[PDB]
Paper text:
The point centromere of budding yeast specifies assembly of the large kinetochore complex to mediate chromatid segregation. Kinetochores comprise the centromere-associated inner kinetochore (CCAN) complex and the microtubule-binding outer kinetochore KNL1-MIS12-NDC80 (KMN) network. The budding yeast inner kinetochore also contains the DNA binding centromere-binding factor 1 (CBF1) and CBF3 complexes. The inner kinetochore centromere-associated inner kinetochore (CCAN) complex (14 to 16 subunits) associates with the centromere, generally through specific recognition of CENP-ANuc.
Dimeric CBF1 binds CDEI with its basic helix-loop-helix (bHLH) segments to position one of the two CCAN protomers 5′ of CENP-ANuc. We describe an alternative DNA binding mode for this CCAN where CBF1 assists in the topological entrapment of DNA via the CENP-HIKHead-TW module of CCAN. CCANTopo engages the 5′ end of C0N3-CENP-ANuc and topologically entraps the DNA together with CBFI. S. cerevisiae CCAN topologically entraps the unwrapped C0N3 DNA, 5′ of CENP-ANuc, in its basic CBF1:CENP-LN-HIKHead-TW channel. However, C0N3-CENP-ANuc is orientated differently in the CENP-LN channels of CCANTopo and CCANNon-topo. In contrast, for CCANTopo, CENP-ANuc is rotated by ~150° about the unwrapped DNA duplex relative to CCANTopo, bringing the histone octamer closer to CENP-LN and further unwrapping the DNA gyre to avoid CENP-ANuc clashing with CENP-LN. This allows space for the CENP-HIKHead-TW module of CCANTopo to adopt a raised conformation below the CENP-LN channel. The removal of DNA-phosphate interactions from basic residues of H2A-H2B is partly compensated for by CCANTopo through acidic residues on the α3 helix of CENP-N. For yeast CCAN, however, the topologically entrapped DNA duplex is the unwrapped DNA terminus of CENP-ANuc, whereas human CCAN interacts with the linker DNA of the 171 bp α-satellite repeats of human centromeres.
Residue numbers in the entry:
A (entry chain f), G (entry chain b): 25 to 103
B (entry chain e), H (entry chain a): 133 to 229
C (entry chain c), F (entry chain g): 17 to 113
D (entry chain d): 34 to 128
E (entry chain h): 35 to 128
């Protein structure tokens, strides 16, 4: 629906940051696959956090929290 | 110069300190992922700040996996990455595969 | 006279004390533990911000920014073990050469 | 309403004045360094009191904190950290 | 008679109800005991965490319900939430 | 009558309650929490132990052994996510083909 | 030369549990090296646990706590 | 049959549930590693049981890294592993490199 919004030139630019200088196609659609997996996992964690807080605004507190839970502590925004 | 321009381009977004994915796309993407994960009745709001942190974690992981998948392609004595190549790189890293 | 002053520390030993009480780690707390922990935290903060200041000198500007911080933390190979899991906000990523 | 939020930003800025008197700090950098000390505080204290529980001893104390820091820090930084903790607590006890 | 405690006997009778004929080696029993200990530690650390997060003095059955939902993959999570709700209801009896 | 008896659970929920007490997880321990988590633990043990029973059946050794435990827990795909970094003693490793 | 006393037929049969059949010679020296590195760290952690515990005999609980902190938690012993 | 015998050999120590390093060597190895890590005055004893657990962790890690290094060699379209190959496999796994 909008995973295509993460588009092939955009992931090309990501891969320029990655240091590549040749990239085939199917790389692209599966980069969308891995991004889907990452987003849904962390989103589920933050969602569970807020809904246990009986709130309905998943919040950066719960996002940095879900990230630390996933094992990677994004860092700079409180936390 | 194709190579000179593209390598210079690597360096400038390599040392750029900031996120680089398209933003309204990413925000609506997380919004619809929450909407589909969430159900009929309970719906969830998102402020600027959660969307922020989600973005930075996604950027950082995909760039890390990106050097690793680039490197598995380098190990194939080539410079294209493929499905199998990266698929593997990630899966060797273990999580989510 | 304040506890931080009596210790020669800049950081709030009293705040570390009360935070240890809030963090429910143990019911009985030695009085030397909060001051020791505050000293350790002050040392680590001073080291990282000095590295960031030298990075700013390398970038020829007189204010610390998250890019300076990210460069310093990634370049220092011991603090990169200490914070290998961290990715910095607007911190970027380090070059291949 | 909005409650007063805990911060170490004043102390961070003061130690930067001691190090480089002419240097300022960006807001994002200041939030980053404010998060540094809390993250370290947690990952020291939890390990230290877990070690105390392994001792089956009631009190979290200076020896427990010293051991926890020297466990979790990489060694090169750990030497400096333990030396500074020891000299700081000694200076305090000398009061 | 200063006795010493462990989960071994309780785990043994759990194995008896699942399969009364099947035995168990003592080191496999230790693996199970350390398994129950590790999952207890995980859920309880999550409980302390969530309590500090909601600034609540106590551990609630619902906040550890949440902790189980965080920690367990979906299949084991649905089974565990059902089992725990059933056990809460039956323990409330007297 | 006993709380551990009325719980209807194998593991004594009184022991779990007092473990939570000394474990410093919070100042007060909700009485439903230890029984609930005891039941969750009992179900997980039931998973491991019905795998133990069927592994004893398959391998013809009536009493379960750590080899069978490691093989079954490594075959349990969903459970390996919980026990990914985990490893088992004297269990070897499941055969790779 | 204890790590050389960790013999090359030994490293070979370990490779064969590892599922490989052909291994270069310097793999033997560098598998010795990886064993050395992991042993060094886990020994650091367990020895320090032991030193703090005041039972200066290195214990299995010290070893398993070392592995646990490392993320390499091992079962059958802390139980 | 060289291949038949050696593959059969893989399978039998692959499904063997037990440790396989030489024992008196491993024990004296850990003993001297503790001795060199320890100093002049404080010396440390080792019982059977610590040596046990150390052994099993070492076995398990090296076998895990072993399938991974075998696999990086497989990815090189070869079946020898080399220094660079494994050196990398391990280092991609991250810790201790």
């Amino acid at each position: 629906d909008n995973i295509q919004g993460i588009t092939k030139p955009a992931i090309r630019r990501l891969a320029r940051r990655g240091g590549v200088k040749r990239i085939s196609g199917l790389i692209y659609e599966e980069v969308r696959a891995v991004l889907k997996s990452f987003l849904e996992s962390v989103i589920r964690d933050s969602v569970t956090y807020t809904e246990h807080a009986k709130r309905k605004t998943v919040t950066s507190l719960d996002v940095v929290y879900a990230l630390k839970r996933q094992g990677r502590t994004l860092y700079g925004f409180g936390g | 110069t194709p190579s000179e321009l593209a390598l210079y381009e690597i360096r400038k977004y390599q040392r750029s300190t900031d996120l680089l994915i398209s933003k309204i796309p990413f925000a609506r993407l997380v919004k619809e992922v929450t909407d589909e994960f969430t159900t009929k009745d309970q719906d969830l709001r998102w402020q600027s700040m959660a969307i922020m942190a989600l973005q930075e974690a996604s950027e950082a992981y995909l760039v890390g996996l990106l050097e690793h998948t680039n490197l598995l392609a380098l190990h194939a004595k080539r410079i294209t990455i493929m499905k199998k190549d990266m698929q593997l790189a990630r899966r060797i890293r273990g999580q989510f595969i | 006279q304040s506890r931080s002053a009596k210790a020669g520390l800049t950081f709030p030993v009293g705040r570390v004390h009360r935070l240890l009480r809030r963090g429910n780690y143990a019911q009985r707390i030695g009085s030397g533990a909060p001051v020791y922990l505050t000293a350790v935290l002050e040392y680590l903060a001073a080291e990282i911000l000095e590295l960031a200041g030298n990075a700013a000198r390398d970038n020829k500007k007189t204010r610390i920014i998250p890019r300076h911080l990210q460069l310093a933390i990634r370049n220092d190979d011991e603090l990169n073990k200490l914070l290998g899991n961290v990715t910095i906000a607007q911190g970027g990523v380090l070059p291949n050469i | 309403s909005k409650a007063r939020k805990e911060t170490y930003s004043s102390y961070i800025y003061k130690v930067l004045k001691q190090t480089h008197p002419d240097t300022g700090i960006s807001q994002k950098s200041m939030s980053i360094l404010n998060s540094f000390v809390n993250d370290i505080f947690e990952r020291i204290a939890t390990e230290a009191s877990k070690l105390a529980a392994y001792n089956k001893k009631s009190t979290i104390s200076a020896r427990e904190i010293q051991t926890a820091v020297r466990l979790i820090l990489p060694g090169e930084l750990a030497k400096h950290a333990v030396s500074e903790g020891t000299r700081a607590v000694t200076k305090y006890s000398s009061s």
